């Protein structure tokens, strides 16, 4: 597990960044911009936000395994997308440094050809229902925000008073069921605007009230900044979708394990013939048999790593589309979440108070 270059102490929340030139960790020198440095640092690592921050003092706190300090270029800060771009080594005379409490995520506090799952195993999984029926899955990013697919909201399914967000249970008939205040969908999603090309198949659901965080309801993390999708890696897709294309929805949330498939193979004529656009990837088996399906759309494709020095699940894909379900040489296609990190943050930063359907290019 090659560590992410930005870390946050589980003990006291100190932020630490890696020095390429020396192999050491350095603290971040406190400054007038502590708040954005905090948020930016959480964003960087793949957490949604900094809930709170504070100043620590090396006289009362210890270096705790760090050699010196980085300083943040506050002029560049508000315009950077990368923390690693705005820091330089500095003396930090006053020995005061930054700590940040991030919105925790990716951690447990306990579909075709998959298995019945248990409660708390996938606590970010939500069911998105219109008029009483399950149409789509989604993934909690906080208690009030859900990441799902744009295609879940075509013309007829745009009356928000009719959507509900079901969380906290794995059986469809069990749990908490809340309203929706807004939907921010991607304006680069050509079909919503003919019909087209499924790039930018991504939307955010803002619930009219936040869910409690429990052992059954937790957010997922996001891919950290610059984090690559690793081909062949086995990740997990879950949902209440159909267990055969021409079948019934699962009554109990299912899970299935599927490897990432390189675009080399997936774009191949044997497979998808150049239909796999660069913000999409495929996952599944050349043989077929295990796949997501109708009604898993919007739900989580999650991959577990240890790059934050503790095991974490991160939402690497969103169930977008496929030609049938579980077909040999037709794997699942997913939205590449890492490619929409700044879009997710901008949307939430901009449309937090909005109501209705909002387009964000
Ligand atoms: N093999 C796969 N991985 C895969 C993934 C995702 C998939 N969605 C569908 C499909 C087919 C007909 C209608 C729909 C609706 O999207 C259902 C939700 C609301 C709008 C209409 N989805 C197939 C399919 C296959």
Atom 23, ligand 1: which residue's CA is nearest?
294
Angle (CA) 277-283-286 rounded to 5° is: 110
Atom 12, ligand 1: which residue's CA is nearest?
294
Atom 15, ligand 1: which residue's CA is nearest?
294
The alpha carbon of 313 and the centre of ligand 1 are apart by a number of angstroms equal to 24
Rg (CA), the chain: 21
Task: Judge whether 318 and 338 are in contact, CB under 8 Å.
Answer: no
Task: Judge whether 358 and 351 are in contact, CB under 8 Å.
Answer: yes
Question: From edge to edge, which strands make up the β-sheet containing 69-72?
Answer: 6-8, 15-18, 25-28, 69-72, 87-90
* Calpha distance 130→138 (Å, rounded): 13
Structure tokens at 207: 């619930």
Task: Judge whether 6 and 83 are in contact, CB under 8 Å.
Answer: yes
Query: Is the Cα torsion angle 132, 135, 141, 144 positive or negative in sign?
Result: negative
Q: What is the greatest pairwise CA distance in the chain?
A: 68
Angle (CA) 266-275-138 rounded to 5° is: 85
CA 66 to chain centroid: 30
Query: Within 10 Å of residue 246's Cβ, how many Cβ atoms?
Result: 8
The alpha carbon of 317 and the centre of ligand 1 are apart by a number of angstroms equal to 15
Instruction: State which ligand 1 atom lies nearest to the alpha carbon of 152.
Output: 19
SS3 61: helix
Question: From edge to edge, which strands make up the β-sheet containing 125-130?
Answer: 176-178, 163-167, 125-130, 133-140, 145-148, 203-207, 180-186, 356-360
Q: For residue 167, what is the enclosing H or E element?
A: strand 163-167
* Calpha distance 113→257 (Å, rounded): 10
Q: Is the peptide bond before 31 cis (omega within 30 degrees of 0)?
A: no
Residue 133, CA distances (Å) to 162, 166, 215, 272 in order: 10, 11, 26, 31
Q: Is the peptide bond before 340 cis (omega within 30 degrees of 0)?
A: no
Atom 8, ligand 1: which residue's CA is nearest?
294
Selection from 104, 335, 107, 81 nearest residue 202 by Cα: 335
Task: Judge whether 164 and 284 are in contact, CB under 8 Å.
Answer: no
Q: What is the resolution of this structure in A?
A: 2.5
Domains of the chain in sequence order = 1-104 (3.10.250.10), 116-122+220-336 (2.40.10.10), 123-219+337-361 (2.40.10.10)
Atom 14, ligand 1: which residue's CA is nearest?
294
Selection from 220, 227, 10, 225 nearest residue 105 by Cα: 220
Task: Judge whether 31 and 41 are in contact, CB under 8 Å.
Answer: no
Q: Which residues are catalytic?
A: 151, 201, 297
The alpha carbon of 243 and the centre of ligand 1 are apart by a number of angstroms equal to 12
* Calpha distance 101→56 (Å, rounded): 13
* Calpha distance 41→77 (Å, rounded): 11
The alpha carbon of 202 and the centre of ligand 1 are apart by a number of angstroms equal to 14
* Calpha distance 42→40 (Å, rounded): 5
SS3 67: coil
* Calpha distance 303→277 (Å, rounded): 21
Question: Percentage helix, strand, coil, to 5, in the chain?
Answer: 15, 35, 50
Q: For residue 280, what is the enclosing H or E element?
A: strand 280-283
Atom 3, ligand 1: which residue's CA is nearest?
332
97 DSSP β-pair partners: 29, 56
Instruction: State which ligand 1 atom lies nearest to the alpha carbon of 245.
Output: 23
SS3 47: coil
Angle (CA) 359-332-137 rounded to 5° is: 50
DSSP state of 8: E
Note the helical H segments in 213-328: 263-267
Reading phi first (left if > 0) and then psi (alpha if -120 to 50, else beta), residue 118 is in beta
Q: How was this structure determined?
A: X-ray
The alpha carbon of 175 and the centre of ligand 1 are apart by a number of angstroms equal to 25
End-to-end Cα spacing for the chain: 35
Half-sphere exposure of 169 (CA within 13 A, CB side): 12
* Calpha distance 31→96 (Å, rounded): 9
Which of 240, 297, 323 has the most ligand 1 atoms within 8 A of CB, as the residue to mutate? 297
The alpha carbon of 318 and the centre of ligand 1 are apart by a number of angstroms equal to 12
Please count the helices (runs of H) and the strands (runs of E) in the chain: 4, 22
Instruction: State which ligand 1 atom lies nearest to the alpha carbon of 284.
Output: 3
Residues with CB under 6 A from ligand 1: 135-136, 151-152, 291-295, 297, 319, 321-322, 325, 332
Query: Is the Cα torsion angle 304, 305, 311, 316 positive or negative in sign?
Result: negative
SS3 336: strand
Q: For residue 341, what is the enclosing H or E element?
A: helix 341-350
């Amino acid at each position: 597990e090659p560590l992410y270059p930005v870390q946050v102490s589980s003990a006291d929340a100190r932020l630490m960044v890696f020095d390429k030139t020396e192999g050491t960790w350095r603290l971040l020198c406190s400054s007038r911009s502590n708040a954005r440095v905090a948020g930016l640092s959480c964003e960087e690592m793949g957490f949604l936000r900094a809930l709170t921050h504070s100043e620590l003092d090396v006289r009362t706190a210890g270096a705790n395994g760090t050699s010196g300090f980085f300083c943040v270029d506050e002029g560049r800060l508000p315009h950077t997308q990368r923390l690693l771009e705005v820091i330089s080594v500095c003396d930090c005379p006053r020995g005061r440094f930054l700590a940040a409490i991030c919105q925790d995520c990716g951690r447990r506090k306990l579909i075709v050809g998959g298995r019945d799952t248990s409660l708390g195993r996938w606590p970010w999984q939500v069911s998105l229902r219109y008029d009483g029926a399950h149409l789509c899955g989604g993934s909690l990013l906080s208690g009030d925000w859900v990441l799902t697919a744009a295609h879940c909201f075509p013309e007829r399914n745009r009356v928000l008073s009719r959507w509900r967000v079901f969380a906290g249970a794995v059986a469809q008939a069990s749990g908490l069921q809340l309203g929706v205040q807004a939907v921010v969908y991607h304006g680069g999603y050509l079909p919503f605007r003919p019909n087209s090309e499924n790039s930018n198949d991504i939307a955010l659901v803002h619930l009219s009230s936040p869910l409690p965080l429990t052992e059954y309801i937790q957010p997922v993390c996001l891919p950290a900044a610059g984090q690559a999708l690793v081909d062949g890696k086995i990740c997990t897709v879950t949902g209440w979708g159909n267990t055969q294309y021409y079948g019934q929805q699962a009554g109990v949330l299912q899970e299935a394990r599927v490897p990432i498939i390189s675009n080399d193979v997936c774009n191949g004529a044997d497979f998808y013939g150049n239909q796999i656009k660069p913000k999409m990837f495929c996952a599944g088996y050349p043989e077929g048999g295990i796949d997501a399906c109708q009604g898993d759309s919007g739900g989580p494709f999650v991959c577990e790593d240890s790059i934050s020095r503790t095991p974490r699940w991160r939402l690497c894909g969103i169930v977008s589309w496929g030609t049938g379900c579980a077909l040999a040489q037709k794997p699942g296609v997913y939205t590449k979440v890492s490619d929409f990190r700044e879009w997710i943050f901008q949307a939430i930063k901009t449309h937090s108070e909005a109501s209705g359907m909002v387009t964000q290019l």
